[PDB]
Amino acid sequence: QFAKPEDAVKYRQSALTLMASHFGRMTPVVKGQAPYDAAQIKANVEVLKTLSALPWAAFGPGTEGGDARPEIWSDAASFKQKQQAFQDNIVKLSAAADAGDLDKLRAAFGDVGASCKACHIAYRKK
Amino acid sequence: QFAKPEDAVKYRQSALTLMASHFGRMTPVVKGQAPYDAAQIKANVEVLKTLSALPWAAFGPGTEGGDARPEIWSDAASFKQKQQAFQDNIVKLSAAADAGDLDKLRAAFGDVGASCKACHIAYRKK
Ligand code: HEC
Numbered sequence: 672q673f674a675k676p677e678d679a680v681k682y683r684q685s686a687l688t689l690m691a692s693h694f695g696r697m698t699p700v701v702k703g704q705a706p707y708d709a710a711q712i713k714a715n716v717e718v719l720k721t722l723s724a725l726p727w728a729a730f731g732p733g734t735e736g737g738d739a740r741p742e743i744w745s746d747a748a749s750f751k752q753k754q755q756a757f758q759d760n761i762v763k764l765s766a767a768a769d770a771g772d773l774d775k776l777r778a779a780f781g782d783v784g785a786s787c788k789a790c791h792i793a794y795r796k797k
Numbered sequence: 798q799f800a801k802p803e804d805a806v807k808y809r810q811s812a813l814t815l816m817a818s819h820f821g822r823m824t825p826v827v828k829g830q831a832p833y834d835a836a837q838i839k840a841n842v843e844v845l846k847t848l849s850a851l852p853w854a855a856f857g858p859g860t861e862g863g864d865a866r867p868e869i870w871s872d873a874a875s876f877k878q879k880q881q882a883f884q885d886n887i888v889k890l891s892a893a894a895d896a897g898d899l900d901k902l903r904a905a906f907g908d909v910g911a912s913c914k915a916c917h918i919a920y921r922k923k
């Protein structure tokens with residue numbers, strides 16, 4: 672869907688921005704600094720689930736650019752492993768949110784965050 | 798969810814970027830220049846539906862900025878009318894996509910596009 676590689680970069684940056692907001696806005700709730708409304712979080716995590724499936728298709732072949740390291744393309748199977756693993760951690764977070772289980776939510780949220788941090792150290796430029 | 802008004806601007810620009818890609822990538826299909834796969838479009842419009850609900854909450858009070866005209870805030874009810882109307886046009890597009898009806902899709906797509914163009918002329922700076 673991208674006319675030029677630059678369009679893919681702008682799409683993925685925007686998808687990751689949104690994904691990041693929908694994940695990060697739950698930090699005060701996980702820490703107990705904001706109230707836990709199970710329905711609010713269930714709906715939020717549904718949005719996060721949709722958004723979390725979007726960036727990866729905008730790292731197609733030849734879409735080098737942005738703050739992306741070149742290792743995303745040469746190590747196709749390893750990058751793919753990390754996105755699919757991240758998405759599976761999102762499934763766990765969805766299950767916790769759907770259950771309205773705060774403890775399960777907190778644990779899953781930490782696992783998701785670790786997946787974010789790992790793909791970052793590996794596949795994002797300084 | 799925004800620490801500063803700037804964060805709201807970056808969120809909404811990113812949401813609108815994504816919304817725009819998910820709408821615009823269907824143009825070749827509506828025009829017959831690309832094949833119509835009803836399942837592909839149904840899934841795409843489901844993504845568009847989720848994305849189309851996101852920008853508006855990032856035009857909260859005092860989030861003036863970006864390429865947004867100031868009339869968004871002073872005419873709160875009118876801007877709100879236009880987003881809710883846009884979202885209702887998205888419901889129509891979803892119904893057409895779910896039905897796998899190409900003619901219905903094309904008509905709905907034009908109505909959605911007109912809603913985009915109108916909010917633009919009114920609420921977006923040159
Ligand atoms: C690899 C499989 C990743 C996972 C999982 C996550 N992110 Fe990431 N992110 C990744 C790359 C390769 C990039 C650079 C994209 C580019 O082309 O520039 C990014 C970028 C971000 C950004 C910045 C987006 C921008 O506006 O430019 C943010 C804020 C971000 N990533 C956050 C983030 C979070 C919070 C994640 C888990 C919820 C996460 N990313 C996962 C690669 C990967």
Ligand code: HEC
Nearest residue numbers: 810813814817820862863864865879880883913916920921
């Ligand atoms: C009013 C209710 C709008 C509707 C409906 C749509 N858009 Fe719009 N869009 C609107 C505003 C006020 C802005 C400016 C936001 C800012 O603070 O800068 C925009 C912006 C865009 C952009 C640019 C995003 C960016 O990266 O900065 C695009 C590409 C865009 N809008 C496209 C678009 C399309 C295709 C729409 C229908 C599917 C659409 N917008 C609806 C206001 C409104």
